[PDB]
Amino acid sequence: EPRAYPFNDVHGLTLAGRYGELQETEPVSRVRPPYGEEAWLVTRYEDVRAVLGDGRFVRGPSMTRDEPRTRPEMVKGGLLSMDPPEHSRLRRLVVKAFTARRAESLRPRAREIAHELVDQMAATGQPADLVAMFARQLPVRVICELLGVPSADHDRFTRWSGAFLSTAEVTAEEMQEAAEQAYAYMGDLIDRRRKEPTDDLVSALVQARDQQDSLSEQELLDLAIGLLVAGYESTTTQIADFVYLLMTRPELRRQLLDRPELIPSAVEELTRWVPLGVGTAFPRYAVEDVTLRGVTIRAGEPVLASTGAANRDQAQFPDADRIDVDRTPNQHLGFGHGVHHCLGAPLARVELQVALEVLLQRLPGIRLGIPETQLRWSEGMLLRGPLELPVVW
Ligand SMILES: CC[C@H]1OC(=O)/C=C/[C@H](C)[C@@H](O[C@@H]2O[C@H](C)C[C@H](N(C)C)[C@H]2O)[C@@H](C)C[C@@H](C)C(=O)/C=C/C=C/[C@@H]1CO[C@@H]1O[C@H](C)[C@@H](O)[C@@H](O)[C@H]1OC
Numbered sequence: 001e002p003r004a005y006p007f008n009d010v011h012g013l014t015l016a017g018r019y020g021e022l023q024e025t026e027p028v029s030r031v032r033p034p035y036g037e038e039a040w041l042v043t044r045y046e047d048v049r050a051v052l053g054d055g056r057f058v059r060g061p062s063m064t065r066d067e068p069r070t071r072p073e074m075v076k077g078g079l080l081s082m083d084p085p086e087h088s089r090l091r092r093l094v095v096k097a098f099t100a101r102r103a104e105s106l107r108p109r110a111r112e113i114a115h116e117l118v119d120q121m122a123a124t125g126q127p128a129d130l131v132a133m134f135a136r137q138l139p140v141r142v143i144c145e146l147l148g149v150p151s152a153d154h155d156r157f158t159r160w161s162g163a164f165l166s167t168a169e170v171t172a173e174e175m176q177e178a179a180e181q182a183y184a185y186m187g188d189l190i191d192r193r194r195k196e197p198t199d200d201l202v203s204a205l206v207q208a209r210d211q212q213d214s215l216s217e218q219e220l221l222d223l224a225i226g227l228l229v230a231g232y233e234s235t236t237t238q239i240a241d242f243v244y245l246l247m248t249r250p251e252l253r254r255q256l257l258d259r260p261e262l263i264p265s266a267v268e269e270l271t272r273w274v275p276l277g278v279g280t281a282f283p284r285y286a287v288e289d290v291t292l293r294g295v296t297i298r299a300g301e302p303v304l305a306s307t308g309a310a311n312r313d314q315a316q317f318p319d320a321d322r323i324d325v326d327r328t329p330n331q332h333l334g335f336g337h338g339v340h341h342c343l344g345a346p347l348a349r350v351e352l353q354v355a356l357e358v359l360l361q362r363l364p365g366i367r368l369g370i371p372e373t374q375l376r377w378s379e380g381m382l383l384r385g386p387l388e389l390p391v392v393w
C-alpha cells in the first residue's frame, strides 16, 4: 500500500513524474524508503513549507529513531538534529559570528581561488574533469578561508575533508583517521585563535556572546567540523549540476554570457529548479496529531517534505518546469525553510555566483567532452550529480 521511495532516478536531475501526480491527487501520501520506517510524503509547496515551518514538527527524534532514509547509514547530530530552545541558542551564537557581511567579504578570495582552479584545470589539457579539478576544490577551500585555516594547510585539510564525501571510496577506518586528523587540527586552531584572535570565523565564534552566554569548547569544535561537512559536498554537487545545465542548455549559457548581472538571479532559479536531493529534507516527527489536507498524521510519525517537488509546484511557480533565470518572485525552498533554513546560504550563494562568473569569463565555450548520455552519475544516494564532468572549451 505505501509506494516504494525515492521516486527520483539518481542518474540525472529529472524530477520524477510521480511527484506531479501526487501533488494533484494525493498530496499527503505514504512511502516505503529503502531503509528506516515507512513515512508520510508531502509534495505541494504550501504543505512542504508548512511542515518545515511548524512548531509541531521536530528533529530531535532523529537521534534514536530508525529514520526513513535513502542509505543504510545515518546522517545525524549537530544543529540539524536539535529543536528549540537548544537549537535556538546554538543558532543565535553561530549567526552572530557567521554573518551575511562575512560571507560577502569572502567573494574576492573565492574569485581568486576559482581562477587558480581554472588555471590548474586548463593546464591538464582537454578534456578536463570539472568535478575533480573545480567543483570538488572550490567549496572546501572557501570553507578553509572562512574558518581561518592558514593557506599552507589548505591542501592537506582538503585531502582530509574528501574522506567525508558520500562518493568517497574509503574504509570505516580510513574515514576514522581522516576525521581524527581534521578534529585534532581544528581543536588546535581554536586554541590558537582563543589566545591570539584574528578576523576569521573561528576567532569570531570564540568571541561570540548572546544573553551573557557563549560556545563551549566542544560546541566550537563540533560547529567548525559541522560547517565544513554541511558546506562542502552540497556546494560541490550544486556547482557540478549548475554547470552541467549551462553546458547542455544553450540559451541558458547565452543569457548569462550576454548578461552576467543575471548570475545571482540565475543561482536562485537553478536552486529552485534543480531537485538536488535524491529524496526529501530530513524527516520531521509529529509532536502531536496534525491534520494536513484532511490526513491525520499521528503523534510520533515521520514526515518527508520534498523541497524538490515543492519548488516545481505549478500552483506556486508559473510554468514551474521552465528555467527562467529572471524569475520574480522566487520564494523557493531550495535552502530549506523554518528554524533549520540553511545557515550557510549567504556563503553558498557567493560561491555559486562566483563559480558561474569565473567559469563563464574564462571558458565561455565550456561544453561536455563526451555525449551527455555517457555521463556517470553519483550513487552516493543523498544528492544527485555527475561523478565526472569531462569538459572542453
Ligand atoms: C549541522 C551540522 C551537520 O550538518 C548536516 O547535517 C547537513 C545536512 C545537509 C542539510 C544534508 O543535505 C540535505 O540532504 C537532503 C537529502 C536533501 C537536501 N536538499 C537538497 C533539500 C540537502 O540539503 C546532507 C545530506 C549534506 C551532505 C553533504 C552531508 O552528508 C552532510 C553532513 C553534515 C553533518 C553536520 C554534522 O557533522 C557531524 O556533527 C556531529 C556533532 C559530530 O560528532 C560529527 O559526527 C560530524 O560529522 C560530520
Ligand code: HEM
Residues within 6 Å of the ligand: 079, 080, 081, 091, 143, 226, 227, 228, 230, 231, 232, 234, 235, 238, 276, 281, 282, 333, 334, 335, 336, 337, 339, 340, 341, 342, 343, 344, 345, 347, 348
Ligand atoms: C548549495 C549548497 C547548499 C545547499 C543546497 C544547502 C541546503 C540546505 C538545506 C536545504 C538545509 C535544511 C535541511 C533541513 O531542514 O532538513 C541546510 C541546512 C544547513 N546548512 Fe546548508 N546548504 C548548502 C551550503 C551550505 C554551506 C556553504 C554551509 C556552511 C558554510 C551550510 C551549512 C548548513 C548548516 C549548518 C545547516 C543546518 C542548519 C540548522 O539545522 O539550523 N550549508 N542546508
